[PDB]
Amino acid sequence: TKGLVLGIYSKEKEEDEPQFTSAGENFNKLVSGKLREILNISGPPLKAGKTRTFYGLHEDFPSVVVVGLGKKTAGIDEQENWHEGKENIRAAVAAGCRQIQDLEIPSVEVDPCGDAQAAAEGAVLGLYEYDDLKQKRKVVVSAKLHGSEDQEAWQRGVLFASGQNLARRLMETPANEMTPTKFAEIVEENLKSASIKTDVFIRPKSWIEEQEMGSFLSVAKGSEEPPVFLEIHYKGSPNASEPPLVFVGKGITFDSGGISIKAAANMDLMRADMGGAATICSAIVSAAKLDLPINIVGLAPLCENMPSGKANKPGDVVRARNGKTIQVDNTDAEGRLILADALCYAHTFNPKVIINAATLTGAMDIALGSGATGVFTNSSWLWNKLFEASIETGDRVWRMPLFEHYTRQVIDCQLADVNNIGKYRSAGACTAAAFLKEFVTHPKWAHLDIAGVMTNKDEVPYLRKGMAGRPTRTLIEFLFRFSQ
Amino acid sequence: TKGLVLGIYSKEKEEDEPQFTSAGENFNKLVSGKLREILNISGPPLKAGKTRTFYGLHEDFPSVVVVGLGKKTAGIDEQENWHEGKENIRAAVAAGCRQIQDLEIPSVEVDPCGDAQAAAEGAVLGLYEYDDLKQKRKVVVSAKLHGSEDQEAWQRGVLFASGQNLARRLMETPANEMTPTKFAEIVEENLKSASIKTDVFIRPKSWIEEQEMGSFLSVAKGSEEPPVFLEIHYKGSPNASEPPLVFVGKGITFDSGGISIKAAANMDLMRADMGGAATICSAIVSAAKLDLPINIVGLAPLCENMPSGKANKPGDVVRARNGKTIQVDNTDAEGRLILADALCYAHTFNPKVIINAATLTGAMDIALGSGATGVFTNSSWLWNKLFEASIETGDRVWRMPLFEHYTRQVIDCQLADVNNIGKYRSAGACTAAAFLKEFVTHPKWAHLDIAGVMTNKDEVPYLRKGMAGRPTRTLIEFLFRFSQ
Amino acid sequence: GQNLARRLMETPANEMTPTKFAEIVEENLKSASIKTDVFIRPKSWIEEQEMGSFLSVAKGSEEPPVFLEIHYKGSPNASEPPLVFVGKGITFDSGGISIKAAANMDLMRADMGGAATICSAIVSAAKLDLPINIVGLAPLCENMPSGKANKPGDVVRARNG
Ligand SMILES: CC(C)C[C@H](N)P(=O)(O)O
Ligand SMILES: CC(C)C[C@H](N)P(=O)(O)O
Ligand SMILES: [Zn+2]
Ligand SMILES: [Zn+2]
Ligand SMILES: [Zn+2]
Ligand SMILES: [Zn+2]
Ligand SMILES: [Zn+2]
Ligand SMILES: [Zn+2]
Ligand SMILES: [Zn+2]
């Protein structure tokens, strides 16, 4: 069995009938108008994101799925902050591919729909499913471009989507399999497979100790699982001495909260508390695959946050790499503790920019949910580059404030230089960002709180229910544009 | 007796000693150098917002309070989105006036500190206290400009500050006194006092019924306190037919939650659930006092949300003025219910702009706290005007997303056209804003969720602990600039 | 028959009041067969019957309570003993003074499901022209908090004493 996905646009006012894409009309012409005739017989027009299946139209394609693409000239929607045409394509193609898979068809050719990269993204992201640990699995589908004219664009989409899917795999995998060491080894193999101009160092606890990363170590000690500090280098610039861009990611492989233990309900989702590490590392792997002409460094402190007879205790005071003391009032505000040391270490590379990502606060989820990643930055130039990249990818970002108003609430501390939780519950994501800022002196730093976009139910049409791997594509796009 | 407040700046690198303002140096000369001498003897220099008191320097001023103003040329802070110099002045003058009041002095003269409007704002906002119901009260202080050169600017500051204090009084007053009827009567007397070019309509229940405002009526019926729909007009434009700007404010005089009853802790603060109505009505009163050349209409639905044998019941379906049905899944999401009807009615005036304010969600507090008012708008032009105005006033605003992503979660409704609570618990402020949007078709609409700025502890230096009346001055400034 | 029960249960409580429920059941039963009788008993009858337990629940709300009594006389022998069906008809359950939590309280509009299922079954039995006598009983009211609602610890007297 071989399937075919074809697109059709919504009818414009002066048109007599809705228009097929170039590929759609070519196929219609090939079958002497039978595609149009059957679509007409089937009833109401196909709206954006909807699908309909026609059988036996051609010997090579027993199953043809037509998908609605919406308005043909849909461009950048100033109200939604994204390119609507691309989002329509990703949604439609994903829907069409899911139908092909339900029919248990192993291979499908996909209409480029006027934007091969967007089409490929919808197909690859849409078909993804983490099922390594199940006996019963859906049929494996091999999606390929229909035609031979937009090969580069199609493959670019496959590459961007594959980067996001690696992130999703890492996030979804249960914590007993996805340990700090396993995560580091998987990232290592993918980066090396991407380019030979790479270096990876899986730093052990002894190195972490030598580096005086006391804040990170305090979180790790409660668990029996060994911690590691992942450091990756991609040497893409023609000039070896060119200052690198540095990415930092929160790698808590499992967050139980520690002594300040979490409630039971849905705690399983905390296996994805290493999402910041997953997204930044995956973006670097993709940049390496594309061979972007830039130097990039990735840093990811990795460990578990568990309760035991040697775990962090509320009230304990720990010393960060930069000498600042931190009062650990709540052991479950552990992300900011491991990031304090990683951010400090990031300055040693004399980077052009420092960008960190973390599933940092439940407050961010209460704030924006899965609508957009929250971005706190001291550089409007940096905010604008991230914003522009998100418009292209559809994986949106939204700016959040970095004000002294919030800093004041974390430096007001009984025992130390800074407290790991604010004096109030208000503005949880903002006080968390203020805490991170006390460990940053760089002029171009951006903190991405991705807690709200950790998962997908049905919000992003082209992602099945599960860990989302967002905003991997936005980081890749940012890197591509920066390199140009 | 009379007190005196004088300013001094932080010393600049090239300067030999910190410099007094023009008024401070004049006073020093008047007392033959005794002020500089005593300040030197007293020790460490005065930093921004700090104060020090000197006695017996002059027969007419037994107590002189010197206040730190910070850097003289501090202008717009690109990281904080406000004019820092003005904020420094407001804080310093407020601290100085509080010291004079603690000394029980009834009159104080205030140094204009290079910006008489900011000085007056610091004095008038800083001294304010709602103490009508207390037997023991602080001395009533009469603040006046030291000198006469900048009297016009001083008077302007007193006006802006008085507008905010009216909002504070309305918000702070207990609900058994500040009923829908009382609120309307106070606004009425203040508006007529401000200008004869005004009209006030205190609409009774019978009018609300004739207007088919079923959503608003459903919230009010649970209580025995009569509801009113306050409608005010300010006819400032030279052209009577010039389209007006319309303001709408949530007026819940007390929110117990109704059948979906609230928890007891701090429920007393719900007496300020009419803050949206207070801020927009006070801004209009001030605009009228300023004699701005524009037409403005203010709309404020007012009622209590109480449990009883005839109160809204979860699952009930009500019909809004536009004919759209609403499923009331949670009776405590009452603000969006009353606003639905007010927003529909706002369109009948064929306005240029529609701006509503409301203490709408606890989620907004979790999102940004008291750092800034959240602004949801379909117009980037409108966002920029509000943002620019906020830089001047110091009472900050921060943009929040108005995406279909959030709309989808409120139109997914079991029984009606729209549900009063989202399908999920994430992004509460965003889903609430989406709900409001279903009752708006205007191209220039802005929704201000002021729940997080309802109160002040000590975040804003120049406001004592209590209801804040934010962001009244930002609305007044927006109106002033719009008229120019 | 099942869909009628679904409609009654799904309809919001501000529309599906004790009075409205009784009126819908009435029109459907009379439509089903002429061998029927419908009694929409008011509060005064409930009081005469000394139904103190039922009355204690209803008083907290301003919505009038009713005791719905329906008969289907299908047996050839008029004196044949009937089968009696009884259904709980709480049109909305807020819990009263022992108030419920907010989450999903909207579903309590279906707390009259017992009344809906037995009354609809009787309507259907009548449509089928079954040769039996049947009586349906449905006490209907809301359970709301107020200044005159049932108070924990209160003692009430049922019809049997
Ligand atoms: C819900 C989730 C994003 C919470 C963070 N892992 P925390 O417990 O470190 O705040
Ligand atoms: C805390 C406060 C802002 C809650 C609103 N009054 P709601 O109960 O109407 O959401
Ligand atoms: Zn995982
Ligand atoms: Zn945690
Ligand atoms: Zn965490
Ligand atoms: Zn009040
Ligand atoms: Zn409420
Ligand atoms: Zn409210
Ligand atoms: Zn019902």
Coordinates of C-alpha atoms in Angstrom, one line a residue, chain C:
Chain C
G1 CA -37.1 7.0 26.6
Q2 CA -33.5 7.1 27.5
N3 CA -33.0 10.4 25.6
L4 CA -35.8 12.1 27.5
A5 CA -34.0 11.1 30.7
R6 CA -30.7 12.6 29.2
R7 CA -32.5 15.9 28.2
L8 CA -33.9 16.3 31.7
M9 CA -30.6 15.5 33.4
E10 CA -28.4 17.7 31.1
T11 CA -30.6 20.8 31.1
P12 CA -29.2 23.5 33.5
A13 CA -30.9 23.8 36.9
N14 CA -32.1 27.4 36.3
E15 CA -34.3 26.1 33.5
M16 CA -34.9 22.6 34.9
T17 CA -36.6 23.5 38.1
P18 CA -39.0 21.3 40.1
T19 CA -42.0 22.9 38.4
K20 CA -40.5 22.6 34.9
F21 CA -39.5 19.0 35.4
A22 CA -43.0 18.1 36.5
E23 CA -44.6 19.9 33.5
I24 CA -42.3 18.1 31.0
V25 CA -43.1 14.7 32.5
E26 CA -46.8 15.6 32.5
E27 CA -46.9 16.5 28.8
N28 CA -44.9 13.4 27.8
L29 CA -47.1 11.0 29.9
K30 CA -50.4 12.4 28.6
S31 CA -49.0 12.2 25.1
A32 CA -48.1 8.5 25.7
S33 CA -51.5 7.3 26.9
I34 CA -54.9 8.5 28.1
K35 CA -54.9 5.8 30.8
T36 CA -52.9 8.1 33.0
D37 CA -53.2 10.7 35.9
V38 CA -50.8 13.4 36.9
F39 CA -50.6 15.2 40.2
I40 CA -48.2 18.1 40.6
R41 CA -48.5 18.4 44.4
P42 CA -47.6 21.8 45.8
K43 CA -45.9 22.7 49.2
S44 CA -49.3 22.9 51.0
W45 CA -49.9 19.2 50.2
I46 CA -46.4 18.2 51.2
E47 CA -47.1 19.9 54.6
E48 CA -50.5 18.2 55.0
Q49 CA -48.8 14.9 54.4
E50 CA -46.3 15.7 57.3
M51 CA -43.3 15.2 55.0
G52 CA -40.9 17.0 57.4
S53 CA -37.8 15.3 56.1
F54 CA -38.4 16.4 52.5
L55 CA -39.5 19.9 53.6
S56 CA -36.3 20.4 55.6
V57 CA -34.2 20.0 52.5
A58 CA -36.3 22.3 50.3
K59 CA -36.7 25.3 52.7
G60 CA -33.1 26.6 52.1
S61 CA -33.9 27.6 48.5
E62 CA -36.5 30.1 47.2
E63 CA -37.4 27.7 44.4
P64 CA -40.8 26.1 45.1
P65 CA -40.7 22.3 45.8
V66 CA -43.2 19.9 44.3
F67 CA -44.1 16.2 44.9
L68 CA -44.7 14.6 41.5
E69 CA -47.2 11.7 41.5
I70 CA -48.0 9.9 38.2
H71 CA -50.2 6.9 37.5
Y72 CA -50.4 4.5 34.5
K73 CA -53.5 2.3 34.6
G74 CA -52.5 -0.4 32.1
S75 CA -53.9 -3.5 33.9
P76 CA -57.3 -5.0 32.6
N77 CA -58.2 -5.2 36.3
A78 CA -58.3 -1.6 37.8
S79 CA -57.8 -2.9 41.3
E80 CA -54.7 -4.9 40.4
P81 CA -51.9 -3.8 42.9
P82 CA -49.4 -1.4 41.2
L83 CA -45.7 -1.5 41.0
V84 CA -44.4 1.7 42.6
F85 CA -41.3 3.6 41.4
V86 CA -39.6 6.4 43.5
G87 CA -36.9 8.8 42.2
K88 CA -34.6 11.3 44.0
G89 CA -35.4 14.7 42.4
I90 CA -32.8 17.2 43.6
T91 CA -32.8 19.8 40.7
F92 CA -29.5 21.2 42.1
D93 CA -27.3 20.1 45.0
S94 CA -25.0 22.7 46.4
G95 CA -24.7 20.7 49.7
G96 CA -26.5 23.5 51.7
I97 CA -24.7 24.6 54.9
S98 CA -22.4 21.5 54.6
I99 CA -21.4 23.2 51.3
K100 CA -19.8 21.3 48.4
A101 CA -16.3 22.0 46.9
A102 CA -16.4 24.1 43.6
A103 CA -14.7 21.6 41.2
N104 CA -17.2 20.1 38.9
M105 CA -20.2 21.2 41.0
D106 CA -22.0 21.9 37.7
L107 CA -22.7 18.2 37.4
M108 CA -25.1 18.5 40.4
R109 CA -27.7 19.8 37.9
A110 CA -28.2 16.0 37.3
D111 CA -28.9 15.2 41.0
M112 CA -32.5 14.6 39.8
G113 CA -31.4 11.6 37.6
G114 CA -33.3 9.2 39.8
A115 CA -36.5 11.0 39.1
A116 CA -35.6 11.4 35.4
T117 CA -35.0 7.6 34.9
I118 CA -38.1 6.3 36.7
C119 CA -40.4 8.9 35.1
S120 CA -39.1 8.3 31.6
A121 CA -39.4 4.5 32.1
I122 CA -43.0 5.0 33.1
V123 CA -43.7 7.2 30.0
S124 CA -42.2 4.5 27.8
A125 CA -44.2 1.7 29.5
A126 CA -47.3 3.7 28.8
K127 CA -46.3 4.1 25.1
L128 CA -45.8 0.4 24.9
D129 CA -49.3 -0.1 26.4
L130 CA -48.0 -2.6 28.9
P131 CA -50.9 -4.5 30.8
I132 CA -49.8 -3.4 34.3
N133 CA -50.6 -0.7 36.8
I134 CA -47.7 1.6 37.8
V135 CA -47.2 4.6 40.1
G136 CA -44.3 7.0 40.0
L137 CA -43.3 9.2 42.9
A138 CA -40.7 12.0 42.6
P139 CA -40.0 14.5 45.4
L140 CA -38.4 17.6 43.7
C141 CA -36.5 20.6 45.2
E142 CA -33.1 22.3 45.4
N143 CA -30.5 22.0 48.2
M144 CA -29.2 25.5 48.8
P145 CA -27.5 27.5 51.7
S146 CA -29.4 30.5 53.2
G147 CA -30.6 32.1 56.4
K148 CA -33.3 29.5 56.7
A149 CA -31.6 26.3 55.5
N150 CA -31.1 23.0 57.3
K151 CA -28.4 23.3 60.0
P152 CA -26.1 20.4 61.0
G153 CA -27.4 18.7 64.1
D154 CA -31.1 19.7 63.4
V155 CA -33.7 16.9 64.0
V156 CA -36.5 16.5 61.6
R157 CA -39.6 14.2 61.7
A158 CA -40.4 11.9 58.7
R159 CA -44.0 11.0 57.6
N160 CA -43.9 7.8 59.6
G161 CA -43.0 9.6 62.8

